[PDB]
Design an enzyme around this catalytic site. Sequence first.
Site, mmCIF file in Angstrom:
data_model
loop_
_atom_site.group_PDB
_atom_site.id
_atom_site.type_symbol
_atom_site.label_atom_id
_atom_site.label_comp_id
_atom_site.label_asym_id
_atom_site.label_seq_id
_atom_site.Cartn_x
_atom_site.Cartn_y
_atom_site.Cartn_z
ATOM 1 N N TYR A 60 20.912 20.320 107.469
ATOM 2 C CA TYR A 60 21.736 20.428 106.268
ATOM 3 C C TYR A 60 23.060 19.720 106.534
ATOM 4 O O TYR A 60 23.948 20.265 107.192
ATOM 5 C CB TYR A 60 21.948 21.889 105.885
ATOM 6 C CG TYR A 60 22.738 22.082 104.610
ATOM 7 C CD1 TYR A 60 24.100 22.350 104.647
ATOM 8 C CD2 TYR A 60 22.121 21.996 103.369
ATOM 9 C CE1 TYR A 60 24.825 22.526 103.484
ATOM 10 C CE2 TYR A 60 22.837 22.171 102.201
ATOM 11 C CZ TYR A 60 24.189 22.436 102.264
ATOM 12 O OH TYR A 60 24.907 22.611 101.103
ATOM 13 N N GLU A 62 26.265 17.114 104.778
ATOM 14 C CA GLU A 62 26.953 16.746 103.551
ATOM 15 C C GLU A 62 27.915 15.604 103.838
ATOM 16 O O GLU A 62 28.330 15.383 104.977
ATOM 17 C CB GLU A 62 27.712 17.936 102.947
ATOM 18 C CG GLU A 62 26.825 19.082 102.489
ATOM 19 C CD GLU A 62 27.617 20.224 101.881
ATOM 20 O OE1 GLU A 62 28.857 20.107 101.791
ATOM 21 O OE2 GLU A 62 26.999 21.238 101.494
ATOM 22 N N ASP A 215 17.194 1.234 82.910
ATOM 23 C CA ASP A 215 16.413 1.924 83.927
ATOM 24 C C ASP A 215 15.059 1.246 84.073
ATOM 25 O O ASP A 215 14.350 1.046 83.082
ATOM 26 C CB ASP A 215 16.234 3.404 83.577
ATOM 27 C CG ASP A 215 15.921 3.620 82.112
ATOM 28 O OD1 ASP A 215 15.992 2.639 81.344
ATOM 29 O OD2 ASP A 215 15.605 4.766 81.731
ATOM 30 N N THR A 241 13.071 5.046 89.736
ATOM 31 C CA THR A 241 12.375 6.114 90.437
ATOM 32 C C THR A 241 11.343 5.498 91.372
ATOM 33 O O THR A 241 10.727 4.479 91.045
ATOM 34 C CB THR A 241 11.690 7.076 89.460
ATOM 35 O OG1 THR A 241 10.751 6.353 88.653
ATOM 36 C CG2 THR A 241 12.718 7.742 88.559
ATOM 37 N N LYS A 244 6.543 6.060 90.776
ATOM 38 C CA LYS A 244 5.752 5.519 89.660
ATOM 39 C C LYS A 244 4.879 4.398 90.109
ATOM 40 O O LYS A 244 3.665 4.533 90.113
ATOM 41 C CB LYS A 244 6.669 5.054 88.556
ATOM 42 C CG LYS A 244 7.478 6.243 88.032
ATOM 43 C CD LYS A 244 7.639 6.130 86.508
ATOM 44 C CE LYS A 244 8.261 7.432 85.965
ATOM 45 N NZ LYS A 244 7.957 7.571 84.533
ATOM 46 N N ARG A 250 9.133 11.376 95.482
ATOM 47 C CA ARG A 250 9.971 11.551 94.301
ATOM 48 C C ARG A 250 11.435 11.448 94.714
ATOM 49 O O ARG A 250 11.967 12.346 95.373
ATOM 50 C CB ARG A 250 9.678 12.892 93.634
ATOM 51 C CG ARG A 250 8.208 13.116 93.321
ATOM 52 C CD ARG A 250 7.977 14.479 92.690
ATOM 53 N NE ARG A 250 6.560 14.735 92.445
ATOM 54 C CZ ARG A 250 5.919 14.382 91.336
ATOM 55 N NH1 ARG A 250 6.567 13.755 90.364
ATOM 56 N NH2 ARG A 250 4.629 14.655 91.198
HETATM 57 C C1 LIG Z 1 24.255 26.372 99.924
HETATM 58 C C2 LIG Z 1 24.714 27.271 98.662
HETATM 59 C C3 LIG Z 1 24.169 27.069 97.432
HETATM 60 C C4 LIG Z 1 23.090 25.958 97.228
HETATM 61 O O1 LIG Z 1 23.726 24.704 97.116
HETATM 62 P P1 LIG Z 1 22.880 23.423 97.295
HETATM 63 O O2 LIG Z 1 23.753 22.317 97.780
HETATM 64 O O3 LIG Z 1 22.252 23.031 95.950
HETATM 65 O O4 LIG Z 1 21.812 23.675 98.285
HETATM 66 C C5 LIG Z 1 24.576 27.858 96.345
HETATM 67 N N1 LIG Z 1 25.548 28.856 96.529
HETATM 68 C C6 LIG Z 1 26.081 29.051 97.741
HETATM 69 C C7 LIG Z 1 27.160 30.157 97.953
HETATM 70 C C8 LIG Z 1 25.665 28.249 98.839
HETATM 71 O O5 LIG Z 1 26.223 28.452 100.107
HETATM 72 C C1 LIG Z 2 8.495 8.808 84.051
HETATM 73 C C2 LIG Z 2 10.108 8.752 84.113
HETATM 74 C C3 LIG Z 2 10.803 9.695 84.808
HETATM 75 C C4 LIG Z 2 10.042 10.837 85.552
HETATM 76 O O1 LIG Z 2 10.846 11.996 85.582
HETATM 77 P P1 LIG Z 2 11.457 12.458 86.924
HETATM 78 O O2 LIG Z 2 11.758 13.962 86.859
HETATM 79 O O3 LIG Z 2 12.709 11.717 87.180
HETATM 80 O O4 LIG Z 2 10.492 12.193 88.026
HETATM 81 C C5 LIG Z 2 12.205 9.636 84.856
HETATM 82 N N1 LIG Z 2 12.888 8.608 84.187
HETATM 83 C C6 LIG Z 2 12.201 7.685 83.504
HETATM 84 C C7 LIG Z 2 12.951 6.541 82.758
HETATM 85 C C8 LIG Z 2 10.780 7.747 83.458
HETATM 86 O O5 LIG Z 2 10.061 6.780 82.744
#
Ligand SMILES: *Cc1c(COP(=O)(O)O)cnc(C)c1O
Ligand SMILES: *Cc1c(COP(=O)(O)O)cnc(C)c1O
Lengths: 470, 468, 465, 467
Positions: A60, A62, A215, A241, A244, A250
């Site tokens: 983890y 950042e 896009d 993305t 596709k 993903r």
């Molecule tokens: C780590 C954490 C989250 C989740 O944050 P993400 O970056 O999306 O993983 C949410 N709330 C608290 C207090 C956290 O420590």
């Molecule tokens: C098919 C498509 C996606 C797919 O959705 P995701 O949740 O991002 O995987 C996203 N954006 C566009 C323009 C798409 O055609």
Amino acid sequence: LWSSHDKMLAQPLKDSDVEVYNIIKKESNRQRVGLELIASENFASRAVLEALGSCLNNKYSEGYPGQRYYGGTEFIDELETLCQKRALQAYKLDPQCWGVNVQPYSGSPANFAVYTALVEPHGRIMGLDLPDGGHLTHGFMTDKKKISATSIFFESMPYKVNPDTGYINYDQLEENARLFHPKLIIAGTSCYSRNLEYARLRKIADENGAYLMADMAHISGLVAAGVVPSPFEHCHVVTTTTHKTLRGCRAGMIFYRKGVKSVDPKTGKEILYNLESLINSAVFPGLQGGPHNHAIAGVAVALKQAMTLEFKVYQHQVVANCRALSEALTELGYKIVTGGSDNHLILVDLRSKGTDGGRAEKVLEACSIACNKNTCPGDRSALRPSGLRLGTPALTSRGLLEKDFQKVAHFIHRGIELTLQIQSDTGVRATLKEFKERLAGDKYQAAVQALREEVESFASLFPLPGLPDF
Amino acid sequence: SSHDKMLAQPLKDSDVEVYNIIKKESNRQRVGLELIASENFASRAVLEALGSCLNNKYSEGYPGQRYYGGTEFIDELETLCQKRALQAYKLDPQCWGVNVQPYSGSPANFAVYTALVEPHGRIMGLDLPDGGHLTHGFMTDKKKISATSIFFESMPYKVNPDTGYINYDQLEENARLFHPKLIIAGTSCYSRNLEYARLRKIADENGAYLMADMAHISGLVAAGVVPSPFEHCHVVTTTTHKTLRGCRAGMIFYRKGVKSVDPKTGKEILYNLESLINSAVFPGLQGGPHNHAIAGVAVALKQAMTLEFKVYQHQVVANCRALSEALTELGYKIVTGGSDNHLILVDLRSKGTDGGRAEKVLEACSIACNKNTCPGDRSALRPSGLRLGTPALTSRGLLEKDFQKVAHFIHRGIELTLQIQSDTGVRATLKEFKERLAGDKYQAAVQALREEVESFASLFPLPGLPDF
Amino acid sequence: LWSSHDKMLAQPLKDSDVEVYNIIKKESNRQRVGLELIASENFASRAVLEALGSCLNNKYSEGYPGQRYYGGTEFIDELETLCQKRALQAYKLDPQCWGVNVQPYSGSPANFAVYTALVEPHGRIMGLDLPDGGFMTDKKKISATSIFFESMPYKVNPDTGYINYDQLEENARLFHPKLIIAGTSCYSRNLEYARLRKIADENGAYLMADMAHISGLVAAGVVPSPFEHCHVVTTTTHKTLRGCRAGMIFYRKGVKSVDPKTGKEILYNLESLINSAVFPGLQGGPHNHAIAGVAVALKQAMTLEFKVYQHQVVANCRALSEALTELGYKIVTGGSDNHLILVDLRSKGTDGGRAEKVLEACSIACNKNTCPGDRSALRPSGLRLGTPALTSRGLLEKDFQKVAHFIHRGIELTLQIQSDTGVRATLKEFKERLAGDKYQAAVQALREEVESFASLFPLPGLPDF
Amino acid sequence: SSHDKMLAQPLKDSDVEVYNIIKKESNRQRVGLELIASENFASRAVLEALGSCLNNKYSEGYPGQRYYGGTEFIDELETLCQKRALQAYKLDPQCWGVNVQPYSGSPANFAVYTALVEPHGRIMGLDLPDGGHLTHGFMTDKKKISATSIFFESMPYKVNPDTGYINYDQLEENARLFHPKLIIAGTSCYSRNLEYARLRKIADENGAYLMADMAHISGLVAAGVVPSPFEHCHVVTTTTHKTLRGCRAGMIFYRKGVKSVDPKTGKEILYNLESLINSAVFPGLQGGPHNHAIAGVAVALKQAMTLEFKVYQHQVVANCRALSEALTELGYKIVTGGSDNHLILVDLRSKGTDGGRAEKVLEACSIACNKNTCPGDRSALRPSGLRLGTPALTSRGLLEKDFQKVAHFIHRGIELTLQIQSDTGVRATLKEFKERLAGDKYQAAVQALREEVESFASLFPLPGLPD
Ligand SMILES: *Cc1c(COP(=O)(O)O)cnc(C)c1O
Ligand SMILES: *Cc1c(COP(=O)(O)O)cnc(C)c1O
Ligand SMILES: *Cc1c(COP(=O)(O)O)cnc(C)c1O
């Protein structure tokens, strides 16, 4: 104890949990003897699967490389730099005048981040409408209430296309942009089977001092191979993305211009671009926090494999099979929107026969065949679509050929005939429930059973690439 | 057969750079020292279920109303995951709803916000400088940073600097004037706990909703050593990678049923948060849900129902208390007296050094840690608190004697920190300390310490991939 | 045909329309023989009346002086400049470091203009609540200021009746506002502008004051002048200055603060912001008659007559308070330095309203209050009286004593009426049976009584009308 | 006795500079020509009712819910003004409601917007450089100016330059993509007429409301020469200072009744805009109402009920037609080939003189006029059109026989400005123009023209209070 702890975190899933194992086995068996025609699906390589299940999940971290919040992230920074270099070299771009970022999780987070970074909250947006081949994240506002987050937090005015010609209208677009005064022009494509004039879009965007956004999620591999013109010459920001046509996990990518934008007529000061800093401040920690390190390796391997000649040959075979399938479908007596399709996904129109897309898709699904329904440009009956969108993004990877695609087209024609027969037997005035109930008829059940058995016996010859040992 | 060979080429033959990078990362993680609460190892079942054919499937939508066709297996898997999540926390099946569609904590929180906050209304949470997450709200005078301040109006309260306990009268008197619409109950670095009864009473008096965030103590709530907040709460958000030892995902727990009865007509008021919460995620913010993440979360949650998880949590808390008392026996005190959770906020105010110097010197000697602002700190750009935890250490197989040896190693490290601090100077700046941190004797000392800890940790196995 | 209409077009209102003429005559006769104690009303001299009915009601000149849009507007620009100079000299304000704007039509438009000029759309504003001498609740939203901008009001100490600066400091430090409002309508005590200025300087926000109630008190020199600490000060010219309904906006000018890093000096931008927000923000053509009226009012108030009038007002207020306390009536907080007084009658049996209705029915206009503490949804629990209303006619100490005696008799009659109907009676039932004969003739006498007290003093205004 | 000589003191004895300024303004307006389409002189009754004891009365609330007591005399005047407003345009009492509480047109429009369209909503109105008012909506890519574009989102539509009519074909197509909540039917001059039938049809088809701003043609609507938009619009806003020979005030007309019926439930849906406008007006953007303005608008509406109003309107239309034909006979071209209302928009693009130069030249020779952007211009910085009207001239006593003389004077002024433009240069600035205006070669011409117009205007009287 020590012995019990070893058999807990170091035990295979084959004997630990038999439910998920059986579910995965059944899913693999179903996808092995089943033909998929969804224009938004593709099989991934073994390298991506092995990289996703690496040891990077237990890390983890950042921050960006150089200003990391935590310590001991040298390997993470090196991997991120390598991924950025591969992404910049995959499309043959200049690192001095272009930038890439793989921090977003998917397409939606990347779009929301680029918006919050450049949409100027409480402003105006202008993008392609949803029914005429558009995405949901490009603005969807109704008369009663909004649904999409972009439409709830921002105001968007979509534009329609000509229902007769089928192409995007550009004459009234300039007037609408001049009378609406937007700040970002979106040219999203979801069902469009033709190209777009990026020059006119860039000119309209510069006329009002706005930005251009496009896009390439639907068309990602063709752009890297050279079949579709690269839109990195007229747009400011580009998102895509890697799940596709890129044959990867993903993930989301964001491209932006880094350099000089214009010159000052007073003295000549170079106005540097102010998009990299905004995108970085909005993607983290503006929208999300800790990224996913397990997908970085997969997307990097996919981008590296996309540079080989095999990817170009695969794209050429994909477009060839698509053209052959479109010609075969048109020869049987089916009307195709805009005649043909330069991309891989096609928009089949079934309004001439009188059958909607719902019952057709239901029967095609019952006969172990995938498909997606969509509306046609200028469809009056919005409750019942009359378009059956098709695509061949993964069939070519298995070994499908011209004769195989012709046989698939013949099977689709037989399914269309069956749908017409069921519709005539249940009546046109009947609703969808009547069709769903009549689909279970004895004769119809035997017909769909024979059709699914034949398609399974025909598709069982082609192999299924994936992960072995299970 | 180039197409078949490319789609089946192993990782060692496709790309060697990523393979070498993964190997080096795995080796460094195997022979090292981790003391961060966020870091935690995962089992092999979740790693095997993550990368499979599930990535090839792409179908968005809730079970029963899927947009695509032929997705009964995905629906069955989702129902099984929901049932397991409901039976894990011993919640009511017909009175609680679980959502696993969000990708992480941030998307889940944003969805809950866009669903039960009515943008540009009222929001009250916890302050960031006083210890908390950035997603809970961060608004300053220069410019907004967090999305909660850009799309909503945040109004956080302050914590007591002397006692270190969460104040209540200030927020109680401020809620009657600010009129909040949703209360936040989440802290990223806090020794004590939160009183959910008072928060629920305030929410009922002001007429608003309440949400909790127990990600850091996720596992602590699955065993039964921490009071479950589902007794007087409405919305709950929790990740699956802080203590649950799973893949990166999120879990949203909401209450469904009747809320109140009419005073005169006596008509029940059915809950209406299900539709809003569902529309906020899809098709409001996300599209196609990640099936691999759902499967991994289901496996990691099902493997935690046996007595092994309870014994592991008990051993974790016992070892944490032992490590805290062992480190305090040498003179290093702990703020707020003690810590009932698996995290400790070490403070070195009496030593003179701040948190940045300690974090840097610890990272230099292969010792994972992180800084945080302690209650009553003035230097915001350079805090003085150090967040320490042992969730991953106990998961490897470390015992009491091993933790005592680790404590002795940390003592030697602290001695090295005091030596470099006295040698650099009490009035040195940041850059000067960072450049003077490297020294011949110090380099040899850190090398010997690293070799010793590596030889001591090499005997312990590593979960997940076998020696990979 | 057209010649016959031209004669009646310039015919006096007495011959054109007799309905409105009779209505105006009846209203004048009622206000002449009747006395009122409202603090939000004051008689205006004939100067503003003659200036409003001048020929300036037909000129349409948009824009500010020097940047007009039409031609032949030299007289309008000269009049506006004269009014601005008179307003700047009425408070001894330096023209180089202070501005003035008379474009707004009333207090509400000027306040909204200042709000939209300083607080951006959907901003944070800090102001005083409505019940504690002053608006947004947790159920609905009425005030547009709270609709377009989220506001967080602060509470005051109800024991001592003073602003809690200790809590206000942390409230402003946590909420981080942008414009602090310093105004009230019922707060009899004074305000400490030093603490507000310090809080605004610490939080980097602005300070706004509203002297609509003491618009004249600051001109004479009775109450302190809030121009030495506040930045934007707005008020009206129809409450104490005895003028027409208008508004004035005063902004600071010059150097705000010096930056030792850059070395330059930051200048104020209130002038441009106010000019861009007032016109063409939410107003079109300015009313020249209103500007002329406020100009002549400010010119007449510059002499010693205004100061002696304010001194007599304070003396009459003190005499009235002493007379009320002598008759056995409790006064809330024992009065104050202002002119408005709050008479308490909770110990008599009726908090408020019951006696106010009977008083209004006996040619005695009064007003209610909004002091905290009410059994029903909203109870006045206090009677607010206004001394500047009756002193404009020429009342003296003996006059105020007679008025106090009349008020005492009316209060006794009200108490008797309420005791005859009972305490369990509601408001509608009490108002229906309020016409009881047992006291009708009685109040009748009181009525003519105050009439005999009103005809003796002349009523100011415009003659022949 | 100091209070006697202080309050009861004439304006001439109290002040001197304001008296001299008022006298100079009256003298300038007496010997000066008035041609602004938004300027008129009110009757003596309005000026007499403006200044009275009504200015000393203060009462907040609505008739029946007065917060202060002793307001029985104000309720009578309020109901009288309401009845006069309802019977002025021949409106049904139990079907439409009138409101005269707003101060001017801007606060009234703001209250109507806040009561109908939710904050940060979507509205559509006429563009400012194409004949629309500033209060209807105006914004650019740099920043915003109007309050409607700041607190809400407005999408203005342009006008067809070739035909000169509003491009109604684009509004129906843009409404389906923009989805507005209120259609603003307003304009600045618009010499032609409008069609409220199609507008109301599009409004009901889009599920929005209609707000018509007929402040410019109010008087015309009261005479029957212009189709009244009451039977086609929902909200109608207007003023009484532009026309009707009254003081500066406002008037709002809202619909109250059965909107539609529901066959599923069986009930009848009733209108609810009355409560919304009542809550938005008070307590809204204003405080206490002005009794003087109410009395003025009431007496004006009562005086407009006689045949004199119809005769004056007919004479105004005849004067406008005569002025248009006289100006066209000289050689000047009018937009759309004539005009339908009292106002007119003269174009000078064919001559080669900008609107600003001609406006300054006319103002320098004691002639009132105001420039405006002509349909088809690239921007509004240098307009090419001039808005003219004759309400004041007709109200003073001018007939069609004098319009030929005023047209000849305007032609002489145009020739003078043409010679000045040809003498100053091709792209001369405003400084050189104003400097050459009083040049030796042009001082005699402008002096003679000013003396002639002064002697011609000093013959007709001016309505108002004598001395
Ligand atoms: C780590 C954490 C989250 C989740 O944050 P993400 O970056 O999306 O993983 C949410 N709330 C608290 C207090 C956290 O420590
Ligand atoms: C098919 C498509 C996606 C797919 O959705 P995701 O949740 O991002 O995987 C996203 N954006 C566009 C323009 C798409 O055609
Ligand atoms: C001139 C005009 C007004 C005048 O009222 P204001 O509030 O001063 O703007 C109102 N509406 C229109 C259309 C006008 O032309």
